[PDB]
Amino acid sequence: MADVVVGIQWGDEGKGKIVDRIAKDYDFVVRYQGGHNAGHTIVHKGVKHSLHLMPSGVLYPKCKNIISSAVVVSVKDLCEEISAFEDLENRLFVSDRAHVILPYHAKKDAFKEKSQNIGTTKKGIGPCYEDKMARSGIRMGDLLDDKILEEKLNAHFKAIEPFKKAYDLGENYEKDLMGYFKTYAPKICPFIKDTTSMLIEANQKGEKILLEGAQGTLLDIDLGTYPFVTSSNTTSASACVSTGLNPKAINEVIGITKAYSTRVGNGPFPSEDTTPMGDHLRTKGAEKRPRRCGWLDLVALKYACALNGCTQLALMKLDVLDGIDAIKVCVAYERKGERLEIFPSDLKDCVPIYQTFKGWEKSVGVRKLDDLEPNVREYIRFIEKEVGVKIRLISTSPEREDTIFL
Amino acid sequence: MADVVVGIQWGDEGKGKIVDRIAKDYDFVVRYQGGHNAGHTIVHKGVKHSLHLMPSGVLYPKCKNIISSAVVVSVKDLCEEISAFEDLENRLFVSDRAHVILPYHAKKDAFKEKSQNIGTTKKGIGPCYEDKMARSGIRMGDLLDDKILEEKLNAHFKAIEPFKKAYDLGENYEKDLMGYFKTYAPKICPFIKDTTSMLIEANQKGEKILLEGAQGTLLDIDLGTYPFVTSSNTTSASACVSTGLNPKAINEVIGITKAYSTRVGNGPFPSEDTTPMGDHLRTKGAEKRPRRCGWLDLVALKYACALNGCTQLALMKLDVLDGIDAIKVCVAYERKGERLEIFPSDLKDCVPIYQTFKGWEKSVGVRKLDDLEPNVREYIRFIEKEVGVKIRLISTSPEREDTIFL
Ligand SMILES: O=c1[nH]cnc2c1ncn2[C@@H]1O[C@H](COP(=O)(O)O)[C@@H](O)[C@H]1O
Ligand SMILES: O=c1[nH]cnc2c1ncn2[C@@H]1O[C@H](COP(=O)(O)O)[C@@H](O)[C@H]1O
Ligand SMILES: *Cc1c(COP(=O)(O)O)cnc(C)c1O
Ligand SMILES: *Cc1c(COP(=O)(O)O)cnc(C)c1O
Prior knowledge:
homodimer, 406 residues, Adenylosuccinate Synthetase, subunit A, domain 2, ten-stranded mixed β-sheet, four-stranded mixed β-sheet, globular, binds inosinic acid, binds pyridoxal-5'-phosphate, cytoplasm (chains A, B), Adenylosuccin_syn_GTP-bd (chains A, B), metal-binding (chains A, B), Adenylosuccinate synthetase (chains A, B), purine biosynthesis (chains A, B)
């Protein structure tokens, strides 16, 4: 259908779990932006699969996993993920137009982070996107032709010369990078395809397509909490730029929202709770950089739902809240005496206004609406009424099957 | 509705004309990407309006013109456009999240162009987008607070120091840029708004929104003829990233296609015709850098229609073809003995396969389907059948009113 799964907060909402849970019903599962800054996590029958760039349809061999054109690819790292699975040939395809992360990029990221202090993943995501905007970047299809690759590498070496000292590239950068591609190009080349053509066709034939967002909406380069964002567009619309699909192809948009909020890295966080009331969240939800913890923020949620056109919500990680005395929800902002109901473009001086809810004790592992505590259902009802989007999926532990459908 | 007007070739298709022609029927007209690399041109009653970043609803005072968040803004240049119109306050709004083009950017563009030779507009578009990906860029909202602006300017000056020689910035860069903002910030600040909120609301209230693409689909940074592209996403999906609108809000997608093709700048162009058969196109269609001229390319058109989800086409500049003996249409590609029907990701060795059509003599200024020569209608019929999208608008001169609706 091109349905889309999107994180509607600042990442870590539980996207990997939801994609894995529904992927069996699709022909294609598509990672459309970001890189291995992502960590989409699947748990099933006590086995944890930590994915980075590998799409989250990988546990269903009939699914075709697509890494689309707006992604940035650390080839070595993707090769390491490929090696963990059997017979990925014919069920993983990497866009020939995806951009390639070089070691300069990670070094540059660390260098710039000394002044900017965004809290990046230090994986060179941003600098890879920069080179894409410069139109100097290498793309996956370049690896298919030794002569083209060699030429682009020589232009890169020439271009980075003035930076070797600053970014601490070392004496052997150029020989090391040559050898890198000698090692990894043969490993990844069989998977490189025109995925744009592939998805245009699939859409035309009415095959079922699931688009897997990374990061989350409030990390969007344009509309998120800039400059405390990633360098890619994270919303549902981005899925129908990366891919070849058009906006009219988008059917369901599933907004993945944790039952509380996190950020990892710096930047504004209106509902962050550094008081003892937040300590439960830290104990069970901070954890690898520990996440900043706080409450669900309906102001921000409503904003993200509008940006994405969510048709349904998945409410994630209810089990983290088990045992908490009370749950707060940020229902509005106070800014110097004004009540704000709408998410503003600058969060300066925005203080959360909270409603308090009774906690629950034992959502963990519940598989039926009937088996949930009243206080859980009361919370769900409040959220979906305030936001105006039905909660259709409820996750009660990391396990694939600990998921309730409505 | 959020309808979208998109250029489905490499720019210069006649977008400005179509937006101006239909804008009276909308509440909002939104420029969603690019900058003053654009030149959307309107002619009405013998007056030519050359727009660059100003949206093409400006001649209808009841329209609200929006410059959205994914645009890059040369403030001085926008101020110069503002000064050509009366009472723009309350009918032009500039996103507080739009990025700001600095003089370093244009210089950097010219510097890099010595090695890359893309054929950019040398307006610093690409380097502005680079700084956006770096998350070091200045945005329009920063101009609203003198202290914030001063801080970002000081970080910029520190960051550009190693480049002053290379990019030939000059002794007085820093004092000149300080004075620039002293001059232009007061002029532009009244127009700076949260346009994301504004369009979310308008969409919720069912107000009519027209989204005005710049450049064209084959210039898209991800899916166009990389590296001979612009540094922004140009398709209909990009309109529902920049803006706050979601993909489900998109209704009509009007693909603007010239009756022949141009490119300006370097890069692949399968249907380019440098033979005498193309000379008519050059005489009447090259013209300020002259455009490379060639034939309509249905392979590329079908690709762009899929990317955008076009619901209708506008066929533009029929008058340029008046007097030509014969018109060719590229219906497929030959690549080393293989017939390709689908646009590939690499145009190496793709040679056009042509069908030839009889020309016409006097489409210029015709306002009724009935008054068109048969050979014009035969061409239209062929195009819309091969592409599978109805031609609903036909332009027979630059003049607003020389437009036929079906
Ligand atoms: O998967 C993710 N989860 C949470 N935050 C992320 C993720 N990927 C990137 N980020 C955040 O996005 C911002 C930019 O990091 P970058 O994507 O490495 O440039 C930082 O705040 C990161 O911590
Ligand atoms: O309005 C436009 N018309 C046609 N080509 C454009 C336009 N804007 C940018 N381009 C082209 O897009 C490419 C990149 O230019 P840039 O947008 O200045 O970086 C070049 O091929 C330009 O000639
Ligand atoms: C849930 C969670 C993840 C995984 O979430 P995705 O959206 O699948 O990336 C990662 N880290 C933390 C701390 C989490 O709570
Ligand atoms: C038509 C045309 C333009 C204007 O087209 P837009 O899509 O409005 O930018 C500019 N230059 C040339 C050569 C043209 O033919």
